[PDB]
Design a protein around this ligand. Structure first.
Ligand SMILES: O=P(O)(O)OC[C@H]1O[C@@H](O)[C@H](O)[C@@H](O)[C@@H]1O
Ligand SMILES: O=P(O)(O)OC[C@H]1O[C@@H](O)[C@H](O)[C@@H](O)[C@@H]1O
Ligand SMILES: OC[C@H]1O[C@@H](O)[C@H](O)[C@@H](O)[C@@H]1O
Ligand SMILES: OC[C@H]1O[C@@H](O)[C@H](O)[C@@H](O)[C@@H]1O
Length: 902
């Protein structure tokens, strides 16, 4: 063997002399550690820019958010299908989780790849059909995971908008589109089987998930093959594009694009540039074309040519295979760099290229292979180094212990790459005990690991939707609901039908809008809403001076006695008279009693039945005007003239009509809901008389107490009503007013919570607290100006331990309910305007509506949706809504003016 030894010395001798010369020729491809630190530092800056919302729009390193928040924990179970496309092979596996997987490779020729997105996806679908056939699972409904090795935009995990083609693929009409849906079109065109792509993940994510399944220290996913890329677990609080602050989420770096903006124009060489000039994506993936094992061999080829041309190789002799693009590939690079086998391989290959390689040439082309595969390994060490620093920092520790899961041919196959990369890495990041785990099995197993979870969520999101589905009414139902009210309106206005009508159409003896001749000083009560207040209104024919003071009524008095309740009112009145300096002279009062009252004239008003929060005994069936008088007596302090008993709708209508003659309808949407309008007397059957109109206090909150709305009432609606004071009463109102909506939302959440869909399945005392969701908060929650952070805060403020996810669902629930309300109220209001256009027999109506109520006033959407609904439900009308800013008081004064007038 003194021969082999003898030879080896010969080559080293031969080698030595040449190496110096080549190192100086390709000096540009000799990146010092210093430079590598520089590149490591530049990459950091690029990573910070991709995560930053401020800088992300022009950041080359996309730092795309995948929707994976943690590596496998063993909770995963089931048999899935995995599609792997973009690597070196198009495999279709069937993982079943121990983890049992079955792969299959399908050839994807240079016609499908560079073809049409349709052709491509038709190929993917066919192969999938083949697999499922072969495998005998087409019957079984199995979840599909898609390992798509390209840059995509995902908002959810089953969303995957292609940004740009990478590596070898370039099919027309895919970029910009949702690959998932594109895949579905193919499977449906074929209409062979049924498939649900529940997840779409990158191969670095898939590799990371795969390794983490085996090693729980796994936080990175690296790929060095047809293309290079890396992903890692990043803290949510830093992922600006995703709203959350708790936990981490995997970030698909897409580092191949590093340098695309020009950041590596000082590193990149003339060879890298020409390699680019003839590539499928000129100017893109620049960092990748210097590292990847799809660009490597061709890079060596471009160097060989340059030197041969310059007579520095094969005595300047060129051959046409040396010039043909792709004659020299990365496998040639790997072999030529083999330990013992290297030099002869260089020969066997180089002669295949037609140049008569000398022993010198073989020794040179091997060194040329080292500089190029080494620059590659050093560049990945640098950028991975940065990811490692970023991880260390996120940990706050000065030392890092993590695991990077690798995969990829160049790494897995080149004889010098792996260790050179390793050594260089740890010299750059000496502050870490980085391990590397090679995904021996491939990406599929990890994608199944993602698909298992994506599926689970997709499943629970489906049940939630089976719930909310109910608070979503079709225009056709809003149309019937409208038609249903109109029938009811007829039943209370008509003699015979009246006693049966649930929507009683109460005659308020207000026969006209302010005639501008009103004058005087009137006292006025406003009871029923949220704030009970006593007012003094000084009208003068034309000027209205107002004054008021809120007097709170305890829940106890409010639900006390007819006496306790009414004695309390008089005392407040007593105080107000003092407060005003009006005490003494008997004054004309206008009682705004916001409740169902049977009147036969202004000055009387028998409480038909309490609604909302009042439940004071011995009050129903009595003339409230009368009760007010007895209370004044028992007191024996002052006296007053109970001139009128008006409802708040009527009062609101007048307050607005005073300024706007066109206002003939009054709407209230606050603690409770109701409306009123100027009905033609010809129709007011309950009241004898034939001329003019009469304001009908449509007690619409009862619409449905007979059952005509029982097709749209949900089991949640039943509950609220069941747990209320007036159980079975005020249904239409119970699904619209601010005293009820919160309770609907609260019972849904309790439901979702029991299902584990929310607040981690635990029903907190606050969750069980009635009225926890006030009009003040619903309005806030449902606000768009409010960030998610803020919505989460309110909910935490309410005492509920919400997460950002809870904060989203809660927010969703509130919108389904308030929308349904704004819609239902719009249907009723729509009916009212038909009857007005029809009663006055006109082709087209222009009427104004006076509105008041905290919900209508505070809520961000209600009014807006409601306005649209009335518009779309009743096209022959142009309803205008006027917000009442002076309360029912002013209007109640104008009523007592004319009320005192007789
Ligand atoms: O370019 P490659 O050698 O195919 O490397 C990338 C590919 O590696 C395979 O082992 C994985 O299963 C694929 O999910 C990945 O896309
Ligand atoms: O529930 P609320 O906010 O009190 O809405 C209804 C109330 O609105 C006030 O503005 C009116 O002055 C009251 O007469 C009415 O009863
Ligand atoms: O296949 C490995 C990687 O190659 C890159 O060039 C692609 O852009 C990545 O999306 C992919 O993860
Ligand atoms: O407060 C607005 C409405 O609330 C309902 O609960 C009452 O029954 C109505 O009479 C009133 O108009």
């Amino acid at each position: 063997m003194i021969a082999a030894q003898l030879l080896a010395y010969y080559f080293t001798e031969l080698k030595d002399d040449q190496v110096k010369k080549i190192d100086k020729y390709l000096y540009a491809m000799r990146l010092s550690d210093e430079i590598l630190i520089d590149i490591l530092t530049r990459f950091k800056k690029e990573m910070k820019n991709g995560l930053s919302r401020d800088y992300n729009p022009t950041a080359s390193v996309k730092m795309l958010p995948t929707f994976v928040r943690s590596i496998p924990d063993g909770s995963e179970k089931g048999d899935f299908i995995a599609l792997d496309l973009g690597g070196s092979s198009f495999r279709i596996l069937r993982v079943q989780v121990n983890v049992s997987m079955e792969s299959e490779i399908y050839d994807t020729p240079e016609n499908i790849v560079h073809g049409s997105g349709t052709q491509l996806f038709d190929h993917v679908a066919d192969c999938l059909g083949d697999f499922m056939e072969k495998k005998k699972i087409k019957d079984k409904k199995l979840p599909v995971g898609f390992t798509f090795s390209f840059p995509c935009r995902q908002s959810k995990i089953d969303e995957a908008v292609l940004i740009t083609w990478t590596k070898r693929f370039k099919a027309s009409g895919v970029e910009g589109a949702d690959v998932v849906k594109l895949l579905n079109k193919a499977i449906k065109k074929r209409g062979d089987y049924d498939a649900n792509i529940v997840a779409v993940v990158n191969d670095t994510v898939g590799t990371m998930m795969t390794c983490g399944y085996d090693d729980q220290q796994c936080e990175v996913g690296l790929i060095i093959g047809t293309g290079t890329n890396a992903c890692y677990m990043e803290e949510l609080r830093h992922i600006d594009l995703v709203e959350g602050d708790e936990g981490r989420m995997c970030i698909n770096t897409e580092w191949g694009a590093f340098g695309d903006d020009g950041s590596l124009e000082d590193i990149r060489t003339e060879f890298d540039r020409e390699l680019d000039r003839g590539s499928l994506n000129p100017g893109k993936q620049l960092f990748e074309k210097m590292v990847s094992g799809m660009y490597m061999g061709e890079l060596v080829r471009l160097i060989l040519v340059k030197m041969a041309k310059e007579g520095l190789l094969f005595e300047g002799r060129i051959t046409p295979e040396l010039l043909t693009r792709g004659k020299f590939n990365t496998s040639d690079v790997s072999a030529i760099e083999k330990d013992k086998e290297g030099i002869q391989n260089a020969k066997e290959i180089l002669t295949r290229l037609g140049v008569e390689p000398s022993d010198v040439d073989c020794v040179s082309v091997q060194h040329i292979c080292t500089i190029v595969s080494f620059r590659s390994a050093n560049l990945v060490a640098a950028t991975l180094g940065a990811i490692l620093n970023r991880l260390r920092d996120n940990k706050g520790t000065p030392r890092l212990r993590t695991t990077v899961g690798v995969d990829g041919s160049l790494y897995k196959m080149h004889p010098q790459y792996s260790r050179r990369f390793h050594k260089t890495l740890r010299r750059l990041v000496p502050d870490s005990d980085v391990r590397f785990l090679l995904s021996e099995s491939g990406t599929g197993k990890g994608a199944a690991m993602v698909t298992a979870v994506a599926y689970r969520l997709a499943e629970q999101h489906r049940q939630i939707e089976e719930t909310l589905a109910h608070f979503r009414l079709s225009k056709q139902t809003l149309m019937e609901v409208k038609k249903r009210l109109r029938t009811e309106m007829e039943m209370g206005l008509r003699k015979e039908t009246n006693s049966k009508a649930t929507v009683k159409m109460l005659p308020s003896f207000v026969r006209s809008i302010p005639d501008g001749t009103e004058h005087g000083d009137f006292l006025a009560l406003d009871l029923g809403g949220t704030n009970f207040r006593v007012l003094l209104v000084k009208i003068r024919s034309r000027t209205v001076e107002m004054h008021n003071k809120i007097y709170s009524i305890p829940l106890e008095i409010m639900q006390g006695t007819g006496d306790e309740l009414f004695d309390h009112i008089v005392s407040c009145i007593s105080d107000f008279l003092d407060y005003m300096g009006i005490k003494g002279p008997r004054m004309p009062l206008g009682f705004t009693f916001s409740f169902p009252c049977h009147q036969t004239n202004l000055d009387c008003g028998i409480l038909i039945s309490w609604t909302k929060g009042f439940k004071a005994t011995d009050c129903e069936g009595h003339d409230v005007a009368s009760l007010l008088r007895d209370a004044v007596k028992r007191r024996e302090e002052f006296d007053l003239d109970v001139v009128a008993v008006v409802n708040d709708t009527v009062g609101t209508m007048m307050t607005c009509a005073y300024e706007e003659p066109t206002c003939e309808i009054g709407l209230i949407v606050g603690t409770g809901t109701n409306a009123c309008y100027m009905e033609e007397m010809k129709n007011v059957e309950m009241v004898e008389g034939n001329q003019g109109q009469m304001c009908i206090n449509m007690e619409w909150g009862a619409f449905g107490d007979n059952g005509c709305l029982d097709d749209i009432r949900t089991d949640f609606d039943k509950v609220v009503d069941e747990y209320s004071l007036n159980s079975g009463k005020q249904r239409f109102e119970k699904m619209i007013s601010g005293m009820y909506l919160g309770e609907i939302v609260r019972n849904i959440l309790i439901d979702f919570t029991k299902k584990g869909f929310l607040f981690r399945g635990q029903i907190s005392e606050p969750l069980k607290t009635r009225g926890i969701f006030e009009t003040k908060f619903l309005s806030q929650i449902e606000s768009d100006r409010l960030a998610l952070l803020q919505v989460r805060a309110i909910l935490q403020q309410l005492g509920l331990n919400s997460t950002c996810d809870d904060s989203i669902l809660v927010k969703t629930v509130c919108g389904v309910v308030s929308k349904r309300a704004a819609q239902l109220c719009g249907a009723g209001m729509a009916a009212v305007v038909e009857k007005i256009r029809e009663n006055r027999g006109l082709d087209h109506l222009n009427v104004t509506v006076g509105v008041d109520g905290t919900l209508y006033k505070l809520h961000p959407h209600f009014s807006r949706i409601m306005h649209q609904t009335v518009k779309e439900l009743s096209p022959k009308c142009t309803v205008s809504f006027l917000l009442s800013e002076d309360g029912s008081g002013k209007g109640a004064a104008l009523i007592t003016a004319v009320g005192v007038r007789l």
